[PDB]
Amino acid sequence: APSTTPVNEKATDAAKNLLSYLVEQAANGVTLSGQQDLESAQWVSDNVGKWPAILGIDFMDYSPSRVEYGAVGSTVPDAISYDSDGGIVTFCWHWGSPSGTYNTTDQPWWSNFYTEATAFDIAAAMDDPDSADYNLLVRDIDAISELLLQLQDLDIPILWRPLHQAEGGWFWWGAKGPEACIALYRLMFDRMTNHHGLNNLLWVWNSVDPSWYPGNDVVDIVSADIYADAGDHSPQEETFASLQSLTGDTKLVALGEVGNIPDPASTGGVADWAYWVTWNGDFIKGEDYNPLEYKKEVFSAENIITRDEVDV
Ligand SMILES: OC[C@H]1O[C@H](OC[C@H]2O[C@@H](O[C@H]3[C@H](O)[C@H](O)[C@@H](O)O[C@@H]3CO[C@H]3O[C@H](CO)[C@H](O)[C@H](O)[C@H]3O)[C@@H](O)[C@@H](O)[C@@H]2O[C@@H]2O[C@H](CO)[C@@H](O)[C@H](O)[C@@H]2O)[C@H](O)[C@@H](O)[C@H]1O
Ligand SMILES: *[C@@H]1O[C@H](CO)[C@@H](O)[C@H](O)[C@H]1NC(C)=O
Ligand SMILES: [Cl-]
């Protein structure tokens, strides 16, 4: 069954308490609501009637290579505000490649997390710790670690989901097979936990295939991102079962991203997702994926937690 002990023995009380709360809720057939982007969370409050429990945001535009092209990151204040309002925060990282950005017509700099938008080679970087690219990877990790340390100084625990969707291959970190991506994940875990003393993090992995798994010693929560056909609100039992066997059923299981919110009237005892995070834009705002009447039902449900109900 899911562990309530963070893999970082030095975890803060706020990180320990968040993991224990999520495990308890999921064991009871309760799922936390979530939404990517503060403006979309505001839309849900304004149109559906509830603030999502979890705010998903991204370190993307703090990536050092993106700063070189004029990017201005602004999500750390949104984490602080959501936490001040009683919510929970998850970060992903659409990591702009440390070198190799093309910045062409078809591959603008602002797409430089996609494999197609950069020359960057994660495998060549990880095989040579003396290389410029290896040193730039560690510098990028240090850049994002500073942001996480600001959040740790404020006693804000974070559901940290780096190197997401890795196995798909469409982001540069997944373009050179599993070994290089696992090595980068474990390097990040060590650099953040040990060198930086980051103790406010719960580590969320986001690939299903066992050959991509970085190990139970460096992961607190396993997840997948599901973009089913518009209007498919099934519980996604097969994916849930694959995420249980990934860890020998020792880690909490969640949805990192959804296009379609799984119907909470059909998940109980089939696929006890700890949380889901709806993507931004049309996925939450339109009528094709998650219609207004359905959203109102989901967010009002007894077995869905919204921000007003969070009680860590
Ligand atoms: O490539 C065409 C694209 O145009 C518009 O999006 C542009 C926007 O795309 C960002 O990547 C998205 C991606 O489009 C898709 O929604 C999904 O894969 O997510 C990624 C990453 O999302 C991240 O950014 C958004 C806000 O854009 C949000 O905060 C989310 O939380 C975060 O995870 C990304 O490439 C952006 O850079 C890009 O916008 C550009 O942004 C830069 C500054 O970052 C500006 O300088 C630039 O002018 C432009 O706005 C459509 O929205 C999309 O549908 C697709 O058509
Ligand atoms: C990226 O490409 C655009 C479009 O050609 C160009 O105007 C811009 O100066 C480039 N950015 C950098 C920092 O070279
Ligand atoms: Cl503490």
Author numbering: 1 to 312
Reproduce the article's own wording on this structure.
Endo-β(1 → 4)-mannanases (endomannanases, EC 3.2.1.78) are important enzymes, catalysing the degradation of abundant plant β-mannans (hereafter mannan) in nature. Endomannanases catalyse cleavage of the β-(1 → 4)-linkages in mannans to produce mannooligosaccharides which may be further processed by e.g. the exo-acting β-mannosidases and α-galactosidases. Endomannanases from families 5, 26, and 113 belong to clan GH-A and share the (β/α)8-TIM barrel fold and catalytic machinery, and catalyse the cleavage of the O-glycosidic bonds in the mannan backbone with net retention of the anomeric configuration.
The structure of the deglycosylated YpenMan26A acid/base substituted variant E165Q, in complex with a α-62-61-di-galactosyl-mannotriose (MGG), was solved by molecular replacement using the known structure of PansMan26A24 as template, and refined at 1.36 Å resolution. The YpenMan26A chain can be traced from Ala1 to Val312 without breaks, and forms a (β/α)8-barrel fold as expected. The active site was identified in the groove with the conserved catalytic residue Glu165 (acid/base) mutated to Gln, and the conserved catalytic residue Glu257 (nucleophile), equivalent to those observed in PansMan26A24. Crystals of YpenMan26A E165Q were obtained in the presence of α-64-63-di-galactosyl-mannopentaose (MGGMM) with the aim that the oligosaccharide would span the catalytic site. However, the electron density of the ligand was modelled as MGG situated in the −4 to −2 subsites. Since YpenMan26A E165Q was not completely inactive, it is likely that the residual activity has caused hydrolysis of the MGGMM between the backbone monomers in the −1 and +1 subsites, after which MGG migrated to span the subsite −4 to −2, indicating high ligand affinity in these subsites. The electron density of MGG is clear and unambiguous, except for the galactopyranosyl unit in the −3 subsite, which points out of the binding cleft. There is electron density present near the mutated Q165, which is remote from the ligand, and was described as acetate, which fits the density well. There is a single N-glycosylation site at Asn103, located on the external side of the barrel, with a residual N-acetylglucosamine (GlcNac). Previously, enzyme interactions with a galactopyranosyl substituent attached to a mannopyranosyl unit within the −1 subsite of CjapMan26C have been described. Interestingly, because of the captured ligand in the present study, it is possible to identify interactions between the galactopyranose unit and the YpenMan26A in the −2 subsite not previously described.
